[PDB]
Design a binder for this molecule. Structure first.
Ligand SMILES: CC(C)NC[C@H](O)c1ccc(O)c(O)c1
Lengths: 222, 60, 272, 338
C-alpha cells in the first residue's frame, strides 16, 4: 500500500537524521564540573567563556560542553551514573577554605568536606577510567591567610615551615593521595586565582593528554 | 520544629483510625480476581499464533 | 604435507569468520578502525577460502589440474588478496598514526565516508596492479625457459619478467613496509613522550615489535627472492620460493590474533 | 514539645503496628496452598527496536497497545510502532539528561523530564506539522523522576526534592502538592479509577495519596533500602514495590499490611522496574542483572525469565490488552516479548 511505503520512508529519514546527529555529537568533548558552592567554579566558568547548567565553548577548533550540577542539592547516588562516559571531571577546591568551617554543622572544615566529596567521586564505581582535573583556586588569598595564620587548624599534622609553596604542595599531595586507581586514571592539578588567563589552555592540554592516552591504550601501547 | 512534629502526630492519628479487614478476606479477593480473568490473559496462557499481533496477524 | 594444510586453512578461515561475526553481532565493535579490520578480515577470508587450497593441491600433486584459465585466475586472485591485505595493514597504521599525533584533526576529518573511500581505493589499486596486468598476458617473459610452462597447462609457476616483478613487489610490499616503519617509529616516539609525564615503555615496544616483526618475517623473505630471481633465475632454489610464499600466506592466519586482541573482541567471542 | 510529640507519635505508631498485627488472620501463602501452579512461562522475543545511540532510561506504552515511547540520554525521545518497528516520531530534547516518559491516554500528548527539573509536554498533532513543545512545567527543586498523565490537562509528577505535584497543563501551575516523604520519590503509579496513587521514595517507604483532598491516607514499610519501582494491581486494591534489597513486596490497601515477598537467594542485584499482567496473576520485574524475572503473584514462585539484554534493564512495561511486554536497557535496545 501507499501508507506502508510512506511510513517506511519516514522511518528511513528519521534513521538518517539520528545517525547524523549521533556522529556529530560523538565529536563533542564532555566535561563534568564539580565542587562546593564556595569552591570558585564561578570564576573558572567565567574564564572558560534551575537544575543543571550547560556551557558550550570552543578552543582551537575543539568543542567543550561543560555540565555543572551544583544546583541539584539532593542525593547524588541516584543520578551520578548519568555522567558515565564524560571525557573528564573538573573539580574545584578553594585553597583558602582551610581555616574556615561550614555554617551548618558543628566544626567541620570546608576543606575536609571537599576532601570527602573528592574521595567519594574519584573512587566511584562509575568513574574508574575517567580522569580528573583538579583546580586549586584562590591562591592569592591563601598566601596572605597562611602568611598571617597557621596551617595546623585543619591539618594538625604538618612537617614544614609556613610558606606558600610548601603548604600548597602539601595540600596538593593530600588531595592526590585520596585516589586508589593510581594506575587507571591520572590527576592534573593547577594552582589558579581570579587572574590566571591560562586555565582554558590547561584544560585543553589535559584533554589532549587524556585523548592521546585513551587512543594509546585502545591500540595497546600504554 | 514543633509544627513538623505536630503534623507528623496528626498524620499518624489520621492513619491509625481506618477500618481494616482481615488478611484472609483480602487474600480471597485477590485469588478470586486472578481466577476470574484467567482466561483473558494472553501472557499467562499462550494464544494461537493466528490471533497474535506480533507473530502472524494482519495490520493496517 | 597433505594433513598440514587442513589445520592451516581451518585456522585461517576460523579466525576471520569469528572476527567478522564479532564485528557484526555486537554493537560496541562498530568503530572506524573496525572498518579497516573488517576489510583485512574479509581479504584474509577470501585468501583462506580460495587462494591456499589451490596452492596446496599444486604442491601436493606436482602439476596444475584445473587448466590454464583457472591457473591464471588463481594467480591473479593470489596477488590481489596479498596486496589488499598488506595495504590494509598499512592504512591501519596510518590511521593509528593520525589518531595518536593529532586526535582533534582526526576526529574532525576522519569519517565513515572517507574510510569507505580509502578502503575502496586500496582495493582498486590492488585490482589494478593484480588482475589487468596478469590476465592481459602482460606479465609474460621473453626467455624460453618459461615457454613450455606458459604452453603446457600442467605448469602454473610464477615465472615473470623484470618490469612487473619490480612493479608488483614495490606496490605490494616495499612501499607499505617503509610507510609502516615510519609511522610506527613516530608512534613509538610519541608513546615514549607520553609515558614521560608519569614497564609501559617495554609494553609499547613489545606490542610494536610483535606487530612489525610478524609481518616482516612472514613476507620480506619472499619479496626479497621475488626480485632476486629476475636478475638471475638460478641463484635461489625453486622450492624455497614456494616455502617463502606459504610462510607469507601464514600471515593471514597470524593477523587476527594480532589486530583483534582488544577485550571487546574477547568478550564477543566468549558470548559467541 | 519535642519529646512530648515524639513520644505520643511513637505510641500512635505502636498502636498502628498492633492493629495491623491483630488483623492478620492468615497468610497469602496459606490461602494459595491448593492453587495450581502457573507452569514454565516461555516468552520469546518477537520485535527489537534499534535507533538509540545511548542508554535508554524510560518507556511507556500507548492505550492503543501499538505505539510506544522511549527516551535516551542522547537527547532523543522516539515514538515507535511495535507492529512494524518503523519509527513514527523522533523528538529532540533541550536537555539530554532525561529520566522519565509518559504517554497521554488520548495519545495527543507526550511528556518527559529529567535533571533539568522541568516537565516538558510535547504535542503530536499540533495543527499543520509534526511536533512542537507545548508546555514546560518548572516548579520542582529536584530532578524529575516520574510522571503520569491523568487527562489531557492534569498531570502528576514526582521529583527528587521529596515531593510530588499535580499540575494543570493548560495553566502551568501546581494545582496540588504532596509532601511527607523524607527521601527522593523515585516512582509513582496511578490507580485505574484515577482517584488515588501510590508513590515510593528513597526513604524505604511507600505512601498512598488522594488526588482530590491531597493528603496521605496510608503508609507502607518493610523494605530495607530505596524503592525504585511501583505498580498497581489490576483491580486497584493492592500494589507491588521493588527496591534495591533485591526483593519485591505485595502490599494491600484494605488490609494495610504486606502480603507476599518475592525474593531469591541467587538474586543480589537491585530491582529497576516492575509491572503486572492483565489478569494480575504474573508479576514481571526487571532487575540490574541484565535479566527480567516473572514471578507468580499468588504462590511467590519464579516461573520464567527474559534474558536478552547486554546491560541492565532500565524500564519495563505491559500493554493494556496484555499481548506483549516491552523492556528497555542501557545497551541501547528495546525488546518486545510474547
Ligand atoms: C605463486 C603465486 C601464486 N604467489 C604470488 C605471490 O603471492 C605474490 C603476491 C604479490 C606480489 O606482488 C607478487 O609479485 C607475488
Amino acid at each position: 500500500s501507499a501508507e506502508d511505503k510512506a511510513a517506511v520512508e519516514r522511518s528511513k529519514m528519521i534513521d538518517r537524521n539520528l545517525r547524523e546527529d549521533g556522529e556529530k555529537a560523538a565529536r563533542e568533548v564532555k566535561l563534568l564540573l564539580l565542587g562546593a558552592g564556595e569552591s570558585g567554579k564561578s570564576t573558572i566558568v567565567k574564564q572558560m567563556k534551575t537544575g543543571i547548567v550547560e556551557t558550550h565553548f570552543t578552543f582551537k577548533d575543539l568543542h567543550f560542553k561543560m555540565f555543572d550540577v551544583g544546583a541539584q542539592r539532593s542525593e547524588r547516588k541516584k543520578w551520578i551514573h548519568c555522567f558515565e562516559g564524560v571525557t573528564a571531571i573538573i573539580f574545584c577546591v578553594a585553597l583558602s577554605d582551610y581555616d574556615l568551617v561550614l555554617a551548618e554543622d558543628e566544626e567541620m572544615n570546608r576543606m575536609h568536606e571537599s576532601m570527602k566529596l573528592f574521595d567519594s567521586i574519584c573512587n566511584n564505581k562509575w568513574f574508574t577510567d575517567t580522569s580528573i582535573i583538579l583546580f586549586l583556586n584562590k591562591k592569592d588569598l591563601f598566601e596572605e591567610k597562611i602568611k598571617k595564620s597557621p596551617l595546623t587548624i585543619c591539618y594538625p599534622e604538618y612537617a614544614g615551615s609556613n610558606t606558600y609553596e610548601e603548604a600548597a604542595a602539601y595540600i596538593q599531595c593530600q588531595f592526590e593521595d585520596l585516589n586508589k586507581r593510581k594506575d587507571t586514571k591520572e590527576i592534573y592539578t593547577h594552582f589558579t586565582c581570579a587572574t590566571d588567563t591560562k586555565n582554558v589552555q590547561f584544560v585543553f592540554d589535559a584533554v589532549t593528554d587524556v585523548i592521546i592516552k585513551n587512543n594509546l591504550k585502545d591500540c595497546g601501547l600504554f | 520544629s514543633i509544627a513538623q512534629a505536630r503534623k507528623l502526630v496528626e498524620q499518624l492519628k489520621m492513619e491509625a483510625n481506618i477500618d481494616r479487614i482481615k488478611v484472609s478476606k483480602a487474600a480471597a479477593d485477590l485469588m478470586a480476581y486472578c481466577e476470574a480473568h484467567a482466561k483473558e490473559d494472553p501472557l499467562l496462557t499462550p494464544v494461537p499464533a493466528s490471533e497474535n499481533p506480533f507473530r502472524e496477524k494482519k495490520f493496517f | 604435507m597433505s594433513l598440514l594444510m587442513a589445520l592451516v586453512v581451518l585456522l585461517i578461515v576460523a579466525g576471520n569468520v569469528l572476527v567478522i561475526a564479532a564485528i557484526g553481532s555486537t554493537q560496541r565493535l562498530q568503530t572506524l578502525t573496525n572498518l579497516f579490520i573488517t576489510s583485512l578480515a574479509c581479504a584474509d577470508l577470501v585468501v583462506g577460502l580460495l587462494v591456499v587450497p589451490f596452492g596446496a593441491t599444486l604442491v601436493v600433486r606436482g602439476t596444475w589440474l584445473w587448466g590454464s584459465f583457472l591457473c591464471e585466475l588463481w594467480t591473479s586472485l593470489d596477488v590481489l588478496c596479498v596486496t589488499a591485505s598488506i595495504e590494509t595493514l598499512c592504512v591501519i597504521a596510518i590511521d593509528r598514526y593520525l589518531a595518536i599525533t593529532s586526535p582533534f584533526r582526526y576526529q574532525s576529518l576522519m569519517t565513515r565516508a572517507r574510510a569507505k573511500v580509502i578502503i575502496c581505493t586500496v582495493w582498486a589499486i590492488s585490482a589494478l596492479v593484480s588482475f589487468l596486468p596478469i590476465m592481459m598476458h602482460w606479465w609474460r617473459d621473453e626467455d624460453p625457459q618459461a615457454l613450455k610452462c606458459y604452453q603446457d597447462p600442467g605448469c602454473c609457476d610464477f615465472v615473470t619478467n623484470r618490469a612487473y616483478a619490480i612493479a608488483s613487489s614495490i606496490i605490494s610490499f616495499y612501499i607499505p613496509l617503509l610507510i609502516m616503519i615510519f609511522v610506527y617509529l613516530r608512534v613509538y616516539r610519541e608513546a615514549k613522550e607520553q609515558i614521560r609525564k608519569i614497564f609501559r615503555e617495554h609494553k609499547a615496544l613489545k606490542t610494536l615489535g610483535i606487530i612489525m616483526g610478524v609481518f616482516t618475517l612472514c613476507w620480506l623473505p619472499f619479496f626479497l627472492v621475488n626480485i632476486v630471481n629476475v636478475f638471475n633465475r638460478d641463484l635461489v632454489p625453486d622450492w624455497l620460493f614456494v616455502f617463502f610464499n606459504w610462510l607469507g600466506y601464514a600471515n593471514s592466519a597470524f593477523n587476527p590474533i594480532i589486530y583483534c586482541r582488544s577485550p571487546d573482541f574477547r568478550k564477543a567471542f566468549k558470548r559467541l | 514539645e519535642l519529646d512530648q510529640l515524639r513520644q505520643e507519635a511513637e505510641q500512635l505508631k505502636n498502636q498502628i503496628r498492633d492493629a495491623r498485627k491483630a488483623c492478620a488472620d492468615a497468610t497469602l501463602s496459606q490461602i494459595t496452598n491448593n492453587i495450581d501452579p502457573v507452569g514454565r512461562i516461555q516468552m520469546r522475543t518477537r520485535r527489537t527496536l534499534r535507533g538509540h545511540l545511548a542508554k535508554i532510561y524510560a518507556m511507556h506504552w500507548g492505550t492503543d497497545s501499538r505505539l510506544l515511547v522511549s527516551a535516551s540520554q542522547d537527547g532523543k525521545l522516539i515514538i515507535w510502532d511495535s507492529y512494524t518497528t518503523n519509527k513514527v516520531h523522533a523528538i529532540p530534547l533541550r536537555s539530554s539528561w532525561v529520566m522519565t516518559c509518559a504517554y497521554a491516554p488520548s495519545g495527543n500528548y507526550v511528556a518527559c523530564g529529567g535533571l533539568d527539573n522541568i516537565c516538558s509536554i510535547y504535542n503530536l498533532k499540533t495543527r499543520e506539522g509534526n511536533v512542537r513543545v507545548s508546555r514546560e512545567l518548572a516548579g520542582h527543586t529536584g530532578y524529575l523522576s516520574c510522571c503520569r498523565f491523568l487527562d489531557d490537562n492534569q498531570i502528576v509528577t514526582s521529583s527528587g526534592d521529596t515531593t510530588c505535584a499535580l499540575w494543570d497543563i493548560e495553566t502551568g501551575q501546581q494545582t496540588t502538592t504532596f509532601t511527607g516523604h523524607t527521601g527522593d520519590v523515585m516512582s509513582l503509579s496511578l490507580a485505574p479509577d484515577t482517584r488515588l496513587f501510590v508513590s515510593g521514595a528513597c526513604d524505604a517507604s511507600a505512601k498512598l495519596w488522594d488526588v482530590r483532598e491531597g493528603m496521605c491516607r496510608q503508609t507502607f514499610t518493610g523494605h530495607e533500602s530505596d524503592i525504585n519501582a511501583i505498580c498497581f494491581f489490576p483491580n486497584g486494591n493492592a500494589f507491588a514495590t521493588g527496591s534495591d534489597d533485591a526483593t519485591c513486596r505485595l502490599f494491600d490497601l484494605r488490609a494495610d499490611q504486606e502480603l507476599m515477598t518475592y525474593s531469591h537467594d541467587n538474586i543480589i542485584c537491585g530491582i529497576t522496574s516492575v509491572s503486572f499482567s492483565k489478569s494480575g496473576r504474573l508479576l514481571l520485574a526487571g532487575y540490574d542483572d541484565f535479566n527480567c524475572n516473572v514471578w507468580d503473584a499468588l504462590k511467590a514462585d519464579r516461573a520464567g525469565v527474559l534474558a536478552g539484554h547486554d546491560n541492565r534493564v532500565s524500564c519495563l512495561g505491559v500493554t493494556d490488552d496484555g499481548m506483549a511486554v516491552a523492556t528497555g536497557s542501557w545497551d541501547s535496545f528495546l525488546k518486545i516479548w510474547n
